[PDB]
Design a protein around this ligand. Sequence first.
Ligand code: FFG
Lengths: 234, 52
Amino acid sequence: IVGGQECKDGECPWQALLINEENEGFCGGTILSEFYILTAAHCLYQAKRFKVRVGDRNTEQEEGGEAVHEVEVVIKHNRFTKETYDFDIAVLRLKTPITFRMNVAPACLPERDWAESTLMTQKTGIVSGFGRTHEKGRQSTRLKMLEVPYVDRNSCKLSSSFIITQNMFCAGYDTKQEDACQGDSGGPHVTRFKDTYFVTGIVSWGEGCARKGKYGIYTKVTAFLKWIDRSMKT
Amino acid sequence: KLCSLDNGDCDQFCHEEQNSVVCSCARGYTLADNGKACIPTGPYPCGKQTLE
Ligand SMILES: O=C1c2c(c(C(F)(F)F)nn2-c2cccc(-c3n[nH]c(=O)[nH]3)c2)CCN1c1ccc(-c2ccccc2CN2CC[C@@H](O)C2)cc1
């Protein structure tokens, strides 16, 4: 995350971190339930074997609230391809259930029609992650979050050098240089409604980070609710 | 106006059935007696920050 603020104690409890053999985070995820994590399909190419850490806000030290989980099943959307980055979504089933506690809790899955009519029409959502804090730089050791305006679909397409499919949406600023970045991929975009946070996007891609006239591109969760439901039973 | 008028006064999901508002909730919540509010079934219901 470029700009934004630290996630303070309890503010982003649905954040997950995918960690490789070196125990370093390389992508985010969103906790959906005690057994399931939502993430980006393109993240699955970033590590041969990986695990999932929950409850972490600071990778520099252990606080006692962190927990690591092995992945039992990887469910990647069969239509994802790096040629288009379309269908950038995967669900992970964990070998053992997540213990919910301060800083560890699931985000809500919305219903499709209501989410599209009520959540995605709000002014802003929130993106979070341990990604780079400048376009050139290393991963953040601190979990960050950023309020990002929803962007008009037309303005979204005109800003992009690449095709924005119906499975994608834009959020961010036109001039203010704060946005998600490399390493935030796979992590939560959530939208608040009456103090309840629903997962609305998966960080997918962007042309650089926080560039003027560009936006973060997210996988639209509402486009995949049936696919997600099926994956959370298989 | 129904659902378009302040989400039908629903805490969470709003649907229009027979020209009337019907509220519903995410998993882990139960619909309150008033048919509008959503009540958590346990600690750490989905979508709630853990600030206390
Ligand atoms: O996703 C990144 C990326 C990069 C860097 C960094 F700059 F760090 F390198 N960060 N980052 C990133 C990651 C996560 C969030 C944000 C972000 N959120 N908000 C914000 O502003 N930025 C930024 C590098 C470039 N990229 C990228 C990946 C994929 C496509 C893409 C799109 C459509 C079809 C096909 C392709 C893929 N093909 C392959 C060849 C290419 O030409 C087209 C375009 C750009």
